[PDB]
Design a protein around this ligand. Structure first.
Ligand SMILES: NCc1ccc(C(F)(F)F)cc1
Length: 330
């Protein structure tokens, strides 16, 4: 079997992407953030403390004939940006774009941090990293992809994120009409539970390509591109008037500047990020200082190929017994 679902940016800056997911019987449709950097499927629910819900659609397990409380199970997650949530666990039927999985662990949020409360367009997250990162205790649970793996035509899913435009998540097949050229596959390390790979270098604008190994993770759940301080400094040095701001917490640049493209290497292939993709607009309403889409990973501890990078490519997440990542131009 296969599945295919449209994913939509939540705002005009592509800060995140939401994808409708059907949960329960009868279906309760929620718009979830598909996150290849985490492994928990959690949702706002009727059990979430009311003051922490502001416009989100909630999952009501009592209205689902297939929902079952997973007795004694709890979950607690904290993300790299400081956000966190926790609650209990149900099992229910979950369908993504026609692809259905029974007995999927649906983690009901009882408490959520303020960054989720203020994001009224995101009803939850669907984790697509490896299941070793799942936070359910005492019995760890499998991701939606893991549970669907046996039923898929091919054990893959693909991410085709749009720039200021809708995109597609596909499960179980590779759409050969959605990219150009050939797909370049590269090795994945699962040692930390992430879709971790090694980029072969970078280039700034029309500069010479610098061959150097950048270890990082492909993370659809992170907005920006986080790279070592040496690379990021070399990029912003080409933008007139750009500087790192401590009060803003990153590199900013004059909104009147034109940004150079950024190229990253996948084996012998090259993925080019247009400079327009790196503009994230004024730091405040009316400001003439703009926030940059490429930032340093020094404080994070890990390099993150977030949406800024991934939306420039067609990305294959190959979940075979030896997992690989595929990148193609589009
Ligand atoms: N990468 C996990 C993640 C995804 C989304 C959010 C936000 F922005 F919606 F709060 C935080 C953390």
């Amino acid at each position: 079997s296969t599945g295919s679902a449209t994913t939509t940016p939540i705002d005009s800056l592509d800060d995140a992407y939401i994808t409708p997911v059907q949960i329960g019987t009868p279906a309760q449709t929620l718009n979830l953030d598909f996150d290849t950097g985490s492994s928990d499927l959690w949702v706002f629910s009727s059990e979430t403390t009311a003051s922490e819900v502001d416009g989100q659609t909630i999952y009501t397990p009592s209205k689902s004939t297939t929902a079952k409380l997973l007795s004694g199970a709890t979950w607690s997650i904290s993300y790299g940006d400081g956000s966190s949530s926790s609650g209990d666990v149900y099992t229910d039927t979950v369908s993504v774009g026609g692809l259905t999985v029974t007995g999927q662990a649906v983690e009901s949020a009882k408490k959520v941090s303020s960054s989720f409360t203020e994001d009224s367009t995101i009803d939850g997250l669907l984790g697509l990293a490896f299941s070793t990162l799942n936070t359910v205790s005492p019995t760890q649970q499998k991701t939606f992809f893991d549970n669907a793996k046996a039923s898929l035509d091919s054990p893959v899913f693909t991410a085709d994120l749009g720039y200021h435009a809708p995109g597609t998540y596909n499960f179980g097949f590779i759409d050969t009409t959605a990219y150009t050229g050939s797909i370049t596959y590269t090795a994945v390390s699962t040692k930390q539970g992430f879709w971790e790979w090694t980029s072969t270098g970078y280039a700034v604008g029309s500069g010479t390509f610098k061959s150097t190994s950048i270890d990082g993770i492909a993370d659809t759940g992170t907005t920006l591109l986080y790279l070592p301080a040496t690379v990021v400094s070399a990029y912003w040095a080409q933008v007139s008037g750009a500087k790192s701001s401590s009060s803003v917490g990153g590199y900013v640049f004059p909104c009147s500047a034109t940004l150079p493209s950024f190229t990253f290497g996948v084996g012998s292939a090259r993925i080019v990020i247009p400079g327009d993709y790196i503009d994230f607009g004024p730091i405040s309403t009316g400001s003439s200082s703009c926030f940059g889409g490429i930032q340093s990973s020094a404080g994070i501890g890990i390099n993150i190929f977030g949406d800024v990078a991934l939306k420039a490519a067609f990305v294959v997440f190959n979940g075979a017994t030896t997992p690989t990542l595929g990148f193609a131009s589009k």
